[PDB]
Structures are given as structure tokens and as C-alpha cells.
């Protein structure tokens, strides 16, 4: 068929980008494990992706806990169980929304703006002139950014769950008349460490490997004109947002199957 040949171009094309994503990343993390240069080089990158992404997490983290403490308060009162609020928002945050929402906003702020800095750096040929400097940029400019992600997002989640659960302890305890000593008490024997507390990290640290890789790859093969780069930014947000939910449904099957 005449139209089935237009798919024959795509089925080869869309798989070669997966070949480029492995081949770029494999060259990024092999050989010369130098630490004298990278240790001040990396800590400037954590100011880029960690500190600037910190404020949006906490100011949104108080709004999720205040909503779940408000909306959850109606569902417990219709089933007449006040004490369950402490084992509800602790339950819901630490296993469902903690890894999923924080990774969404991280794909929002740090996921997109990282891709902008990469493609712009090829657009003004700062990349193509660094090869004339005979320094391989994939270990030089990519791997300081790639480790800056996967170290950051676990520390972006544990700040999210904590300030999330503190705001949940406001509206139920203080405003909606519940004793303070009763609220933490049901929460004390609520959750264990082995299949809940470290399990929050396992969902979060496997998200950081994907989002940082899917962001920094789109900066590496984007069209260097000013049209193609902003196309690549809005291709990064939509592709990470499927991959966070394409993984979470798998990663909620193993832990609770």
C-alpha cells in the first residue's frame, strides 16, 4: 500500500533515536573517573537543579497536604473514624503521591530547563568548539548534569513528603478539632520500614534515572535552530509525563502484588 511505506520510514527512524539515547549515555559514564575537576563542577550544577527547584516543591507540598486533610476529613466522618486521618495522609503520601507528583513538578521545572541549556549550547556552537579544545563534552558537560539529577530527586522527595505531611497535620488537628496526641498515635504503628519507608525511595530513585536521561537526550539531538529547540522542550515534558506514569503502574505492581 502507498500509505504503508510512510510508516516504513518511521519504524526505522523512531528506533534509531533509542539507539542514540543509549550510545550517548554509554559514552557519558565510561573512563577517567576524575574527581578533582568534577567536585566543584558538579556542585555548581546542584545550584542549578536542586536549589531553584526547592521552592516550588515546598510551596506546592503544603497545598497537597491541606487538601487531603480537608477532603479526607469528610470521608472519615461519614464512616465515623476520626483517628484514621493520621494513617490516611501518611499512607497516601508515602506510597502514591509522594513519588508521582514530585517527579511531575521536577519534570516541569528541572526537566525542561535542563534541555534548554543543552540545545542552546549547541546552537551557539559552544559544543562544537569544545571538540576543537579536544575535551570530550559527554564526560565533561553531560555527566556533571546527569549525576546532578539522580542525586537531587530523592532529596527532593523527602523534603516533599515531610512538608506535605506537616500541612496535613494542620487542618485536621488544629482547625478541625482533633487532639494532637491522638493523631500521631495512630500514625506511629501505621507504617513499617521495610516495605513502606524504603519503598518510597525505590519509586523515587528510579524516576530520577528516567527523567534526567530523557531530558538531556532531547537537548543532544534537537535541531539547533531557534524553532526546533522550543519544540524539543515541549517534547521533553510530554515524554517524561508518560514515562513517569508508564513506570509507576509497573512499580506499583511489584510492591503490592
Amino acid at each position: 500500500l502507498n500509505a504503508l511505506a510512510s510508516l516504513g520510514h518511521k519504524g526505522i527512524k523512531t528506533l534509531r533515536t533509542f539507539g542514540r539515547a543509549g550510545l550517548m549515555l554509554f559514552n557519558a559514564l565510561v573512563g577517567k573517573p576524575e574527581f578533582r575537576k568534577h567536585a566543584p563542577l558538579l556542585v555548581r550544577q546542584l545550584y542549578n537543579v536542586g536549589v531553584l527547584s526547592m521552592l516550588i516543591i515546598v510551596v506546592s507540598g503544603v497545598f497537597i497536604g491541606m487538601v487531603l486533610g480537608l477532603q479526607g476529613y469528610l470521608v472519615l466522618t461519614t464512616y465515623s473514624a476520626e483517628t484514621s486521618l493520621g494513617m490516611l495522609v501518611a499512607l497516601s503520601l508515602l506510597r502514591e503521591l509522594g513519588p508521582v507528583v514530585a517527579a511531575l513538578l521536577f519534570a516541569g521545572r528541572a526537566g525542561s530547563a535542563l534541555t534548554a541549556e543543552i540545545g542552546l549550547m549547541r546552537a551557539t556552537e559552544q559544543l562544537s568548539s569544545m571538540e576543537m579544545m579536544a575535551v570530550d563534552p559527554l564526560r565533561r558537560v553531560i555527566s556533571p548534569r546527569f549525576w546532578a539529577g539522580v542525586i537531587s530527586l530523592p532529596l527532593l522527595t523527602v523534603i516533599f513528603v515531610a512538608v506535605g505531611i506537616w500541612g496535613g497535620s494542620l487542618v485536621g488537628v488544629s482547625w478541625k478539632g482533633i487532639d494532637s496526641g491522638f493523631f500521631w498515635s495512630a500514625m506511629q504503628n501505621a507504617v513499617d520500614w521495610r516495605m513502606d519507608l524504603v519503598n518510597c525511595l525505590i519509586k523515587s530513585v528510579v524516576f530520577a534515572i528516567t527523567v534526567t536521561w530523557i531530558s538531556l537526550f532531547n537537548g543532544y539531538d534537537a535541531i539547533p535552530t531557534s524553532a526546533g529547540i522550543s519544540r524539543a522542550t515541549t517534547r521533553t515534558v510530554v515524554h517524561s509525563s508518560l514515562a513517569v506514569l508508564g513506570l509507576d503502574f509497573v512499580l506499583t505492581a511489584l510492591m503490592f502484588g
Binding site: L15, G19, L23, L254, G257
Partner: protein, 144 residues
């Protein structure tokens, strides 16, 4: 470029290979069926726990009444390594609460008679029923 497709394939193969063993454990045992004639199984649904003294030993499904004598004939699911059960066996339905599951908690014992020991495996029938978990019978009786 004749190498990108190869590392594209190896990435996607190891993507699905990690995926398939992931979905595997997140999802069984060859048993033998045992027939049982009852009187009432109201509330005992399919996949109900067969239990011996409190610990589960099988699954109660079958779901089907024999349409010539109208005794509820139920084939159980008792595992093949259960080979030394004597014939002294009672079949009882219990609920574990007021409304839990109404599961089957059958009784067995080692009352070996003076005629050898008959075995119960692979398609036999225990003609020992329980016949009641209706309260309206006996709360209807004493209250009149």
C-alpha cells in the same frame, strides 16, 4: 549507521526483559478433586477456603447442582501430596465471624476402625454434611 539499530535493539530487548520478570512475580499446584454431597451452601461462594482445623488446604468452586437428585454435589480441590487421610471425616461450613466468608472448615481425625483404613483421594465422596448456617431456622423455632 548499522550500529545504532543494534544498540537500539539491545536497549529495547533488555527493557522488555526487565519488564517481563517484573510482571512475573506480581501475578499453580496440581491437586485432586474430591466430591461432597451437601444440603446448604448459601453464602459460600467460589474460591472459598477449604480448611482443616483452621489452616487452608484448598479451594471450593465447582458451582453447579446435579439436576437429577438435587443434592449439592461439590468437587473440592485437595492437593496430591495429601495421601494418608482416613475415612473419618466431617464437612462443616463456618463463617469466622457473623459475616466473614462462610468458608468450609471440615473435620478429620485418625479414628482408624477395626476394618483397616479406607482412604480419601482422587474423586471419592464424604456423605457427611453440615446442612445449616441459617439463623431463621432455630430463631424461628424457639420464638414461634
Amino acid at each position: 549507521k548499522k550500529n545504532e539499530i543494534w544498540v537500539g535493539i539491545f536497549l529495547l530487548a533488555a527493557l522488555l526483559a526487565a519488564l517481563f520478570v517484573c510482571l512475573k512475580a506480581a501475578n499453580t499446584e496440581p491437586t485432586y478433586t474430591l466430591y461432597a454431597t451437601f444440603d446448604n451452601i448459601g453464602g459460600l461462594k467460589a474460591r472459598s477456603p477449604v480448611s482443616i482445623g483452621g489452616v487452608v488446604v484448598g479451594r471450593v468452586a465447582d458451582i453447579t447442582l446435579d439436576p437429577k437428585t438435587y443434592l449439592p454435589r461439590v468437587t473440592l480441590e485437595i492437593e496430591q501430596r495429601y495421601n494418608h487421610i482416613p475415612d473419618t471425616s466431617s464437612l462443616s461450613i463456618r463463617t469466622s465471624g457473623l459475616l466473614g466468608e462462610q468458608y468450609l472448615a471440615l473435620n478429620v481425625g485418625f479414628e482408624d476402625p477395626e476394618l483397616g483404613t479406607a482412604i480419601l483421594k482422587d474423586g471419592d465422596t464424604i456423605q457427611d454434611t453440615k446442612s445449616a448456617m441459617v439463623l431463621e431456622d432455630l430463631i424461628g423455632q424457639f420464638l414461634y
